[PDB]
Paper text:
In BsIspF trimer, the four-strand β-sheet of each subunit lay roughly parallel to the threefold NCS axis, forming a compact bell-shaped trimer of approximately 45 × 60 Å in the axial and equatorial dimensions, respectively.
The BsIspF crystallizes in space group P21, with unit-cell parameters a =56.96, b =89.30, c =84.71 Å, β =100.85°. The crystallographic asymmetric unit contains six monomers, which are arranged as two trimers of closely associated subunits. The largest Cα r.m.s.d differences (~1.5 Å) between the two trimers occur in two loop regions, the first one connects β1 to α1 with the residues 34–39, and the second one links α1 to α2, which comprises residues 62–72. Both loops are parts of the active pocket and involved in the binding of 2-C-methyl-d-erythritol (MEPP) moiety. BsIspF trimer have three active pockets which are formed by the interface between two adjacent subunits, and here the magnesium ions deriving from the magnesium formate dehydrate used in crystallization are co-ordinated by the side chains of two histidines and an aspartate (Asp9, His11, and His43). Compared with the structure of EcIspF, there is also a hydrophobic cavity along the three-fold symmetry axis of BsIspF homotrimer. The volume of the cavity of BsIspF (1024Å3) is larger than that of EcIspF (718Å3), which is consistent with the looser packing of the subunits in BsIspF. In BsIspF, no ligand binding in the cavity is observed because no obviously continuous electron density is found here, and only a hollow cavity is presumed in both native and BsIspF/CMP complex, but regarding the highly conserved residues involved in the cavity formation between B. subtilis and E. coli and the size or dimension of the cavity in BsIspF, potential ligands of isoprenoid species could bind here.
Numbering used by the authors:
A (entry chain B): 1 to 135, 144 to 158
B (entry chain C), C (entry chain A): 1 to 158
The structure:
Amino acid sequence: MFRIGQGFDVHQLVEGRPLIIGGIEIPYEKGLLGHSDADVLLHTVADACLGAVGEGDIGKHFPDTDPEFKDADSFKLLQHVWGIVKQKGYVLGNIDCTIIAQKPKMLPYIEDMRKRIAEGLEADVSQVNVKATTTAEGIAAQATVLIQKG
Amino acid sequence: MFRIGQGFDVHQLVEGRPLIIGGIEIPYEKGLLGHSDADVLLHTVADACLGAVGEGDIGKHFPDTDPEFKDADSFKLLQHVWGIVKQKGYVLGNIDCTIIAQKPKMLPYIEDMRKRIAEGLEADVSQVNVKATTTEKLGFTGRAEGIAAQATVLIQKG
Amino acid sequence: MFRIGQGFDVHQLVEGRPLIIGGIEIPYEKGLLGHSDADVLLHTVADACLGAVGEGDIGKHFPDTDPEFKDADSFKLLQHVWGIVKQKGYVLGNIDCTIIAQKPKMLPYIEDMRKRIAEGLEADVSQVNVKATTTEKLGFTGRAEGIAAQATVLIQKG
Ligand SMILES: [Mg+2]
Ligand SMILES: [Mg+2]
Ligand SMILES: [Mg+2]
């Protein structure tokens, strides 16, 4: 058995907050707006994993209104989501993710995002793909995941 | 043997139509514009299914020109599409779907959509995921001009 | 083993360039803007394929700044990508693609794009699905600024 999931998120850009994407802090004048660290890539990854196993989305498991998830580290939240997936008997097949952002340039941080995502999904880096495009009020991300019994 | 499909659709919100999403009636003062009931989520589920078996899209099977599909029930269209998938030898593995909408809030109706989609794919509700998110006021859906959806389906021999 | 990949791309329609989509030249007033032939659909197919094997995106293999990307034939680029997939031991499961464009009407060329993509992926036409949808006048594609495409691929050991 394999199962498929998909995630899509957008976060608003704003001054004063730090920019964190795929678990990596990126030097920039504007961070993303959110109640947790607002890592839009790790949120999308988490939502794709939740969706593959039929467990709604991260809003359902870590609500915005829950003070416990104020300034939450989104890598920790991904680890908990991955606990839910493992409990259903699944491991990672592979994941393919896209960051949509006009600025900053993501290329110098992509390889550490992949390591970080792999770590959070307990997989090898060869199972994780991250790309960026630009095509500027926010940063979006999309992810598609295939999980397998294991 | 597994096959993947993907659907993407977007409908304009207007005054003076019902809002029907995922086969569920949502009491709301705007609804979706289209030749059929405009059910954006069932259209993307149906497109994902047709995509997975190489049978085009709903436009091919139920065109806007042909007048007989005027105000058609999108649940009924989904069942006809599911008939095509079954004839090819496939059943549902699982489906993950996203509604993209600033308003209204979808969360009270999610479980019902999942039930209705499960019924249309002849599947267990554990096989169907539906989530709703906003674009944080950004874009055509962010400013309530329309509702978008996406769906990704995995089907398997059965 | 099966692997999944996803691609997404958007290109501007501009005056006096050919419109090449899915490897097929379509008669039209405008073409897509880019360094290569700007075939938005073959770019997304290529990206989905590279994504499935963890090899980045077309920009990693054929940067904009590479003089052989200038006016490159995106079908040849797809064949290069497919060689990468084949060296890892995979063949096509199936692919489902969507062209989002307000105009022109894709429907007369779809079958040819399917055959071309099938040829590039060394597969049967039954494994390739391509659908075309308009945006209902909404967004950047809805206001004829461009053409968008998405593709989801399932590959398998072969
Ligand atoms: Mg988020
Ligand atoms: Mg529709
Ligand atoms: Mg391109």
